[PDB]
């Protein structure tokens, strides 16, 4: 047998539900999700990491120049040098007059924290969303089973054909441009992938770590070897990238909302518990029995001990109650107002026992099933002093429903006495002819 | 210097432009596309292909029977029989007695051609659009250069800054569920991955072809072996999806409008030249001159030789002319509506001289630029008898502005002397007092 249903997003809480038919005994069930995977189909684009500047041998003569050349390398420079007259140590200067003859010919290059680390520049993608559940129906226990949002999922465990929402809600935060180190993670508006930043941020723009593609600009610019030094004074940019490795800011794990987080490889968002879930499981029909075997309810009666308004399901009360004959029975709750402890109990001869229940409600007046049999037992006043409660409108009280009626009847009896008087005194004036 | 543009879809066609500067020369352009890529964030979902089915030994004995188990296979079977009472050639028939031990054990598995041959089931995402340009500007030849439809992209092809677009047309017809085999591609509306289609197209429900996840039924049943035979007389389901490969219909590529194609690997759709493209490139200034120093226009005049109306720019007009000194001065066709054959010519003392030119206009009256001097040549009428023309409404003839005129004015007219004479009357009646 198939039951389906549309349970809300409830990451942590479990879920039991009675569920029954015509002729035969009733069964319940315990859903409780254990994880929520939301998978982008994302990928890398670009990395980036530190530079590196190396330096040829610069020529040198007695006279006369050797050429600059197009060394290729990002952000190369080269240029002549004359009358460089520079002196070497117990030399004799290299010359004999004007030396004319230095290139100071450049090299930029990479880092090598690049290997172990560099950027890691994504465009992400919609792809998908999964989860992990606890099902522990019936009379089976802690089955944890994970599977994919989509509506149409089949999957069996055991006798449960699983289908699966999908979710009502239908967004998680990301971004396509988001970029990450280490565990950290960061939204990069866009890493200007092809756009040479000045190496700002774009330090090296290179597709990926063996791309030794480096559209950036260290902005490289040599200065005039002198002082007889034999030496390539120059000029560029620092890492930018870096500079902002001083920037960093708070990633988005850190920001996420709902109290939620996230893993590295898929980009698995991490049960924002927020929706509700269309599933459809079946059910081992088999797992049911007959109706009219069971042992039969009678004498209903339930008393409401006391409930302190609570999170802990605060709030004890019992029943008292004469059995058709004892054994077991299940208690559901179909209006989960006092959030009961017990789902399914033993039902002796006479079963005249208790149970457990948090409601918000100051008081509720409501009821709940037992053994195929729903008994009115109303919920008390309750006292105040993670988790849910019914808290929607249920801690009605005595003078709310007081007044409210009060004022009410108040203004409609002198409003219709009102206009009445005025028919009541134009009748008899009508009478006079 | 930078210029920037807003240029159609054109995937074949080229384009030139002459680009000028106060004080300077003016020079060209002429951009051509080469190459129009439209690549979605696709993937695969699953594969599909025939399946196999084998049997192991059928068990036997001379009495009694074995078992029959949950031999993991799909769709797998297995029935004891009884008293099967088999012949062997020249045997002893097995027993002695009621055999009764016949387990018709059965096993489904996958085809061989899977390796070679399976389905390519996807599911396609947003992705990105490309294209390649070729560029022979100015003083440049044949530069094709290809980037990615964005309005950002940053690429500098010598002294072209190129940035392009992003096209105002914003589809290609795809599909997130299309499915290939061979060369050829289909759009699968779904293929039903988890769900085994009675093996009607899911033959092999399977996530991969390493994936051995046979989520398909063959609905294979056994029959008794019987007649003394030893076999697994038995049923299944032929393999559907084959079933299908009788009935495979017309590829998208073969479908896809606006003449253009497709790519393999990444779904590239090939120049289905819609839309117009925002560029924007940077120039050489220094390609520039001044304007001062240039061999200077005078004299204007050209004469409208001849066209007839029709794709190759089938119409030849001339000048006739005296020039201040010779040298070369562009014709740029600021109206394209003859589409000039000529973009720059060698402007020689008394540059008199002809071009060519095609409109689809029975007869222009329009004008166009040469050497930063607009002049003007109508356009005589055109005889009648791949590429574009004019074709907008500039066919006008000599009949048409004729008549329109002709009707208007005669409407105008009467109507203007019928309202006159109402007053026209009036005025002298109210004169009588």
Redesign the interface.
């Known amino acids: 047998y198939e039951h389906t249903a549309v349970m809300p997003n409830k990451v942590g809480i479990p879920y039991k539900a009675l569920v029954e038919r015509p002729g035969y005994a009733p069964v319940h069930l315990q859903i409780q999700l254990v994880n929520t995977r939301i998978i982008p189909?994302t990928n890398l684009e670009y990395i980036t990491c530190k530079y590196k500047t190396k330096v040829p041998s610069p020529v040198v003569k007695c006279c006369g120049a050797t050429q600059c050349t197009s060394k290729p390398h990002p952000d190369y420079q080269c240029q002549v040098f004359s009358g460089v007259y520079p002196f070497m140590y117990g030399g004799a200067y290299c010359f004999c007059d004007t030396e004319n003859t230095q290139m100071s010919e450049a090299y930029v290059e990479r880092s090598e924290e690049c290997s172990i680390d560099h950027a890691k520049a994504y465009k992400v993608?919609?792809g998908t969303v999964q989860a992990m559940v606890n099902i522990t129906y019936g009379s089976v226990s802690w089955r944890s089973a994970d599977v994919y949002v989509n509506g149409?999922?089949?999957?069996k465990i055991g006798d449960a054909k699983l289908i699966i929402g999908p979710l009502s809600s239908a967004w998680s935060p990301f971004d396509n441009k988001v970029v990450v180190y280490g565990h950290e993670v960061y939204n990069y508006d866009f890493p200007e992938y092809?756009?040479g930043k000045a190496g700002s941020f774009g330090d090296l723009q290179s597709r990926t770590s063996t791309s030794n593609d480096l559209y950036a600009n260290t902005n490289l610019k040599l200065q005039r070897p002198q002082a007889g030094i034999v030496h390539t004074p120059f000029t560029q940019v620092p890492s930018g990238f870096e500079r902002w490795k001083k920037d960093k800011g708070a990633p988005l794990n850190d920001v996420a909302p709902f109290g939620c987080s996230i893993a590295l490889e898929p980009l698995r968002a991490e049960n924002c518990a927020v929706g509700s879930i269309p599933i459809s499981i079946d059910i081992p029909d088999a797992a049911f029995t007959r109706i009219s075997e069971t042992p039969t309810v009678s004498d209903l009666e339930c008393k409401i001990t006391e409930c302190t308004y609570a999170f802990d399901f605060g709030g004890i009360a019992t029943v008292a109650y004469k059995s058709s004959k004892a054994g077991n029975c299940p208690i559901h709750s179909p209006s989960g107002v006092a959030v009961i402890k017990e789902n399914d109990v033993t039902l002796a001869e006479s079963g005249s026992f208790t149970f457990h229940f948090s409601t918000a409600n100051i008081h509720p007046a409501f009821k709940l099933q037992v053994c195929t049999s729903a008994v009115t037992c109303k919920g008390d006043c309750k006292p105040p002093k993670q988790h849910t409660e019914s808290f929607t409108s249920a801690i009605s009280a005595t003078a709310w429903s007081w007044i409210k009626v009060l004022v009410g009847g108040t203004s409609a009896f002198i409003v219709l006495g009102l206009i009445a008087t005025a028919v009541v005194a134009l009748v008899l004036f009508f009478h006079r002819h």
Chains 1, 2 share one sequence.
């Open positions: 189909s993608h919609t149409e999922t089949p999957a092809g756009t």
